[PDB]
Antibody, heavy 222, light 219 residues
Framework: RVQLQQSGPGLVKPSQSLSLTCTVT?????????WNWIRQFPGNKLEWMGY???????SHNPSLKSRISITRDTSKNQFFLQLNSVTTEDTATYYC????????????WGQGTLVTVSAAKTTAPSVYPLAPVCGDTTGSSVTLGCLVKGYFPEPVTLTWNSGSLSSGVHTFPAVLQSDLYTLSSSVTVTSSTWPSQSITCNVAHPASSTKVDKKIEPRGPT | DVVMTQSPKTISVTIGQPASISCKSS???????????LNWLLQRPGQSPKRLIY???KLDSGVPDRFTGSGSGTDFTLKISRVEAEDLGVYYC?????????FGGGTKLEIKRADAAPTVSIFPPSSEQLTSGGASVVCFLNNFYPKDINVKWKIDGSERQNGVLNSWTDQDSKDSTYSMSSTLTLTKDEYERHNSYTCEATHKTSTSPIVKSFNRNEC
């Protein structure tokens, strides 16, 4: 079936341009579809930006007043978005989405790429282990965590034991303060399993090419 | 431009019961060839929007048949015959008949479940962070229902208001609960000056707060 995937720089300076790529697999971009760009702002607000269809014909929202270009490269089976003169109001999650030209069916969206429009500097996170206090380890379950502090821009990825620990996890939305984000995640396991079965938080921050793999050590002797 | 108005804004439904949501457009969405370009989509937490209904009344590709779209002209309805927890999220309508194409503002479907008290856990600053100059105290309030909850921080027994940042999860389809993290950030020097740190969670499941504490420099 058709699969779409956005790629492109996640941080853009005000007054410059955002440039995104959508890679289509499982279907030729010269057949049947309208290839759309859609973005999402805070508040469940979705805005249709435009399309390029299977014949190369385009359409875009008048809200974007001359700032938008939608193009394609049929040899690469990709289509593209350029949005110029960006401001902080263009910060949003950008999606590519194919719908069939004939009936609007078969809607297929990429995973979405966050683009932040900001002058603030890229900053790698510090990743701190959250080890439980002694008094809260004598129950049948135990909760551990990880604090990812001081990074910019979004996003980071966080897994536990390289993804093999996925049950009992809560990863919280980041909070932004002074142009840096902080995010936390908790994981809960059966207490008798820890510390015999180690637990590590794996954090990646693609914008700074940084990864941290932080093993949670108990408080007390290790 | 066409305005797409969804109601209600939010709906809370018990698993197994039906759900019905409305989308009304400011202009008719029938076209010159007898097609009505009206779609419904669901956006689950942390995911992209996904197809449900198209052409006003047709099940889109792969979509469970528990979803039905009805209506015509300007008034459209989405019905879910029997709600499942994985149905939670935000439902949108979209129109493709009138340029520029527009979306409804969304309706959020919440799963109603039995009240649950939070599981509360507090964590001192790490040794690594303490070498930095800063000190963050973290409290998790996990797997509770309903979503409204209150957290209060105390340092040596007195309530502390600045330096507190909170974050809430979306509803979890696995158990229909909510979770919250609260982080109290101090300077290292202020943290090392005081002794006991307390997180108190107040939730409708109990008349008395759940209190979790530690002493700095005790395991």
């Amino acid at each position: 079936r058709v699969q779409l995937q956005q790629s492109g720089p996640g941080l853009v300076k005000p007054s410059q341009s955002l440039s995104l790529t959508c890679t289509v697999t499982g279907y030729s971009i010269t057949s049947d579809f309208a290839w759309n760009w859609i973005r999402q702002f805070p508040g469940n607000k979705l805005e249709w930006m435009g399309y390029i269809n299977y014949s190369g014909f385009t359409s875009h929202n008048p809200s974007l007043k001359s700032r938008i270009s939608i193009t394609r490269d049929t040899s690469k089976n990709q289509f593209f978005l350029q949005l110029n003169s960006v401001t902080t109001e263009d910060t949003a999650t950008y999606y590519c989405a194919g719908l069939l030209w004939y009936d609007g069916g078969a809607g297929s969206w990429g995973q979405g790429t966050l683009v932040t429009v900001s002058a603030a500097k890229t900053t790698a996170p510090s990743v701190y282990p959250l080890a439980p206090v002694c008094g809260d380890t004598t129950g049948s379950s135990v909760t551990l965590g990880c604090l990812v502090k001081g990074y910019f821009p979004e996003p980071v990825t966080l897994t536990w034991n390289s993804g093999s620990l996925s049950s009992g996890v809560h990863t919280f939305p980041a909070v932004l303060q002074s142009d840096l984000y902080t995010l936390s995640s908790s994981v809960t396991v059966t207490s008798s399993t820890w510390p015999s079965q180690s637990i590590t938080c794996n954090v990646a921050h693609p914008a700074s090419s940084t990864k941290v793999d932080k093993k949670i050590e108990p408080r007390g002797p290790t | 431009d066409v305005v797409m108005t969804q109601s209600p804004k939010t709906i809370s439904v018990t698993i197994g019961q039906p759900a019905s949501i409305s989308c009304k457009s400011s202009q008719r969405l029938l076209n010159s060839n007898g097609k009505t370009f009206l779609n419904w989509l669901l956006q689950r937490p942390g995911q992209s929007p996904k197809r449900l209904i198209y052409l006003g009344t047709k099940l889109d590709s792969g979509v469970p048949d528990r979803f039905t779209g009805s209506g015509s002209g300007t008034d459209f309805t989405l019905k879910i015959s029997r709600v499942e927890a994985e149905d939670l999220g935000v439902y949108y309508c979209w129109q493709g008949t009138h340029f520029p194409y527009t979306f409804g503002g969304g309706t959020k479907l919440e799963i109603k479940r039995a009240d649950a008290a939070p599981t509360v856990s507090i964590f001192p600053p790490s040794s690594e962070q303490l070498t930095s100059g800063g000190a963050s105290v973290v409290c998790f309030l996990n797997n509770f229902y309903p979503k409204d909850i209150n957290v209060k921080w105390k340092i040596d027994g007195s309530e502390r208001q600045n330096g507190v940042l909170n974050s809430w999860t979306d509803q979890d389809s696995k158990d229909s609960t909510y979770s919250m993290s609260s982080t109290l950030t101090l300077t290292k020097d202020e943290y090392e000056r005081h002794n006991s740190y307390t997180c108190e969670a107040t939730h409708k499941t109990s008349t008395s707060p759940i209190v979790k504490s530690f002493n700095r420099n005790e395991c």
